[PDB]
Amino acid sequence: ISADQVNQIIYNLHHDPFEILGCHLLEEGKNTKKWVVRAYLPKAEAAWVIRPTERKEDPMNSVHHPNFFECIIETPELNHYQLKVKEGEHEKVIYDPYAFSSPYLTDEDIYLFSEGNHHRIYEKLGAHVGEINGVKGVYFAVWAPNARNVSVIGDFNNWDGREHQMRKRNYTIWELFVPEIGSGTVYKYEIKNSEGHIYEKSDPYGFYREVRPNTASIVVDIDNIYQWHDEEWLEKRRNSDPLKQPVSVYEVHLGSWLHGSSAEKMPLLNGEADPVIVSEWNPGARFLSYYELAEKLIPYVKDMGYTHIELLPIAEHPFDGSWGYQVTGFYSPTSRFGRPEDFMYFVDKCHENGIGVILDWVPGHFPKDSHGLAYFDGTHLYEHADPRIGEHKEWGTLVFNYGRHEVRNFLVANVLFWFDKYHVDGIRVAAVASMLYRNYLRKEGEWIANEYGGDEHIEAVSFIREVNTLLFEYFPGILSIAEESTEWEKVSRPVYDGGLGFNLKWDMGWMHDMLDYFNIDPYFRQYHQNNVTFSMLYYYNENFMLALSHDEIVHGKSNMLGKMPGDEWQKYANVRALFTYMYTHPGKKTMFMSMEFGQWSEWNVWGDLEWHLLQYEPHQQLKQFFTDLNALYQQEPALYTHDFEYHGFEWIDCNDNTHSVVSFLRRSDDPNDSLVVVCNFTPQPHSHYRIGVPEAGYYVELFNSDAKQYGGSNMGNLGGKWADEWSFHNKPYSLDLCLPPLAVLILKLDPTKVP
């Protein structure tokens, strides 16, 4: 490029920057092509083009002006890239703002979509505000290859689409530009199938929707509604390994954390909306907006000291009682809580407070609701036609055809969509078994094996591996968390080693062992010491997340206090002992709303949590317990730097089944950060209980779950204990400890204490 062309850009004299900026073909070789990417990046000193799917990074060179950058790349196709921009000490990674000249589908878009490789198809499919033939309007496009006809109906044509019949491109996608209409436009697709049957559909790629039980899609100017402030958070995440840092997740169902009064409007960011009544049964109650939740949920979580909030599915879903797991609008955050920008505000505010956001994502199935993806164009389009692989008959739902390119693309681009437009920090997928197995909840003779005569769902395994590959390439440093309940191997291992590509797996065995153990009368725990210790035997096969989730405090299982035996005092002690053990055991941490203040009742999705309990000392003390334990967890490297290395854990002794006592070390990089954990899982206090420690010195009582401020009896070691030179548990030195009842101690050598 020439200096005059550059100067025309710098000084805003150029007639169309898209001629010069973005990705331009220079020449074709035999096997390859020469491309140039150009960017105008004012205030940037340096820049790179990332080809994340190819594992490649090329520097950009300043050309004629310090803020005008060129990068020449030889590669057959350059569809998938990001710009890295350095402004002083700070780096951001972005999509090229000059990637798309035109709002309409190109030959290239349609080709990539057909191969299932359009990682940004949601820029072109759906509804987009744009300019065609010199007029501002909205481009609509939808995949419906077998439709006889498709029309856009909406507010703008009184739901009569005779003048808004769409144009079929390449026998696969319907499009229409509509002039003068913009964001706020309420619309659906009217489809005639091959039999002449006419019916209405929500926009599969729709970015916003009316409030359930209404189903109309709404046009969003998704790139011009919110100003982000989280560049520093995103830089930090991209440049960190979340496996080497503290992850304590507060799991939340947004619709049932806290309700407001339905007698006022729902405040939004710089706006308001009609209240959304939580139900006909509880009509005085409304949901909080994403905006109110940003003002109330985020400081609450910040004060508790959790690192992450995990949301039950917020993709648009018709029925409250699905909890979100039955999705019909994969590309919009539910309108129950306001608008897309309100949710953007919520993620931005989490990032300002140093809190990450994980989404429950549901690529496994979708329900039969006629507004949604089911039998979309008069064929099994999104779902496989054979019900032996295309229905979960026990659930009444449909299974995506993962082998069909445009379906794979729908889902793969969907997971990227939440990281791109909503800046989320991870996903969790429930019931991965449901996807992995051809015989899942199917009886003999009602399923067919794969082409090798196995039960493995080959197309699903392949899909899951592509999701995790692309996710970590485009957004390094995220969390991809799986719950898989059948002992499938290498769930949280890289795809190159034959894994599924998650970086964490819920330890469901650990959950079952812990809740079965603490449910047992203390006298009888001696028959069940294996519940405490067994899960360290398979621990190193995956990167485990220790999750006590929503699923464990519904459907007659009781909330945590209700699972515990004894009087009120012992029930609380049991909770403190379990959670202190969970926070000191190797693995990341997940717990669900209500567990942190001792809600007695089960989680009820039709109401909000029992906040009135925090009027009373016992609930308050348990919340202070969790607050201090989260604080300890972020402050003690040995609790998080080596969760997944042998170095990080060693049993001291775990053979005293008779007294239900176990003890272990946690270690980190610095030997002086080592922690001695001692667990007493009966109400029998011990005056003198010897534990081997690795070195002489004073061992501080860093934490004691029986402290009086947690609702305990306040027994312990009055600040700490000097190690005797007294061989015990194959260790040179030992502590003569007081063990409080139904309690866990954490002790740390203070190597600079005065003898």
Ligand SMILES: [Mg+2]
């Ligand atoms: Mg009509």
Ligand SMILES: [Mg+2]
């Ligand atoms: Mg209530």
